[PDB]
Amino acid sequence: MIAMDIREIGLRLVGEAIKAADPYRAVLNAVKVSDDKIIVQGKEFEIKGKVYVIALGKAACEMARAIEDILDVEDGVAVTKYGYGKELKRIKVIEAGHPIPDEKSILGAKEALSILNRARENDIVFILISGGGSALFELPEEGISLEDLKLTTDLLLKSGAKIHEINTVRKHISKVKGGKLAKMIKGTGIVLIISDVVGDNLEAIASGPTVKDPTTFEDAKRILELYDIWEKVPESVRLHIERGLRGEVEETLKEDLPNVHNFLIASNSISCEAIAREAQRLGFKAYIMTTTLEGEAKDAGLFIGSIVQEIAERGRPFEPPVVLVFGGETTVTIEGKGGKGGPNQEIALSATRKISDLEALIVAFDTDGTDGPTDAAGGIVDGTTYKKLREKGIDVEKVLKEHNSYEALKKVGGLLFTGPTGTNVNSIVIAIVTSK
């Protein structure tokens, strides 16, 4: 087909990853509607009643809007952050607190329970989940106030508690977390989830209101005691947990519910696949190297750069033209003040020397639109970048040591600005080699 510079190709692939992660588009890509059938990622469901919507997270309204555009919704609620508003046709919108829950969070949860009380065994209920659902959508167990929750969560952090141990305790004092929301669905539950978690563990997203929770009340008590806060937490918390130990209150979801189906519709992997698919259409062989890349940014750039070197030099592990995709979320370790920059900018800049003079390009970007404390989403460099940096008398190693990669990339057209993206499935590095 038509010819394209390696840069147009790279930017084209970046656009594909972002589109595949768009909450609105992601829902439409996953949910297809016939005349009486709803097909979610291949799974077919017959419409034998009404359709309800319960959305929670930063993209609640956008996801809800997609459902309303392809299905008539009897009623529902969308709980999102303050400012994320955006009106809907038949779905009530509520803005709540985040990262700290407030009374609106409770109001949202109560609104959701009301809807589930009305939905019948023959109705379909869409549960739309995105980031921030834990604070935005919450309803404490009996006798427990939002303030009791705050104090408990605070004592957990104050005493240094592992994140999953905190989720265990929180899941056991919430009426909707730990699969409890799914337990309230009388009909068919179709859950659409967007993941901003490396590895995509559903138990963590919004505290898994529709997924199983293997932890128990006993685990929660052990944890509070282990950190000597069992006596420090409010009486209402100890009481609810003791009641759980006595079997007076239901446990968090332990088994699978044949009527509630969880679908992950936007994630780093889904965006990487969108990249590989487009790459193949453009005539490249494409490979997803990983979707769980973690570690120091600078070093990730050296490692990806070393593979690019091997490919351009010996045609292994793959023969060009080829596209390699690395997803995950790297980090920059700063011991001091540091300069201007971020992870993806350091990945890109660090790789410049190893790909110097090669017919290759590396673009590393964060799908949420920002990288480090800057307005750039990441960096984009090619085989000419290193020499352009040297021509301006820039010492790359020194720049990286000072963690001031933004300033270096800024001078050689190496910054990637996406502006607001409306989503977050973490970062992706695309490496392109067009020739040896």
Where do the domains of the chain lie? Answer: 1-21+267-436, 22-266
Q: Which amino acid is at 183?
A: K
CB-facing half-sphere around the CA of 68: CA atoms within 13 A? 20
Q: In CATH, what class is 22-266?
A: alpha beta
User: Is 377 in contact with 421 (CB distance < 8 Å)?
Assistant: yes
* Tokens 């604070």 found at: 135
- CA separation for the pair 330, 51 (Å, rounded): 41
- CA separation for the pair 242, 264 (Å, rounded): 35
- CA separation for the pair 436, 434 (Å, rounded): 7
Q: Which residues contact 241 (CB under 8 A, 6 or more apart)?
A: 172, 173, 217, 220, 221, 224
Nearest to 415 by CA among 367, 368, 365: 365
In CATH, what number does 1-21+267-436 get? 3.40.1480.10
CA 378 to chain centre: 18
50: its two tokens: 């009404």
414: its two tokens: 């190496």
| Backbone phi and psi for residue 192, each to the nearest 5 degrees, phi listed first | -110, 120
Nearest to 327 by CA among 194, 133, 196: 196
Q: Which residues contact 415 (CB under 8 A, 6 or more apart)?
A: 345, 376, 379, 380, 406, 409
| Backbone phi and psi for residue 248, each to the nearest 5 degrees, phi listed first | -80, -20
- CA separation for the pair 264, 270 (Å, rounded): 9
Q: Which amino acid is at 351?
A: A
- CA separation for the pair 321, 281 (Å, rounded): 13
Q: Which amino acid is at 7?
A: R
Q: Which amino acid is at 269?
A: S
Nearest to 346 by CA among 413, 393, 404, 305: 404
User: Is 126 in contact with 190 (CB distance < 8 Å)?
Assistant: yes
**Exposed / middle / buried, residue 239 (Cβ in 10 Å: 0-12, 13-18, 19+):** middle
302: its two tokens: 């050296």
Alpha helices in 162-256 (DSSP H): 163-171, 180-183, 217-226, 235-246
Tell me, in Å, the resolution of the deposited structure. Answer: 2.1
Does 58 show up as a binding residue in the annotation? yes
Sheet with 75-81, side-by-side order of all strands: 92-96, 75-81, 51-56, 124-129, 188-194, 260-266
- CA separation for the pair 346, 335 (Å, rounded): 15
User: Is 347 in contact with 307 (CB distance < 8 Å)?
Assistant: no
Do 1-21+267-436 and 22-266 have matching folds?
A: no
- CA separation for the pair 345, 406 (Å, rounded): 7
Using alpha carbons only, what angle is made at residue 178 by residues 331 and 422, rounded to the nearest 5 degrees? 45
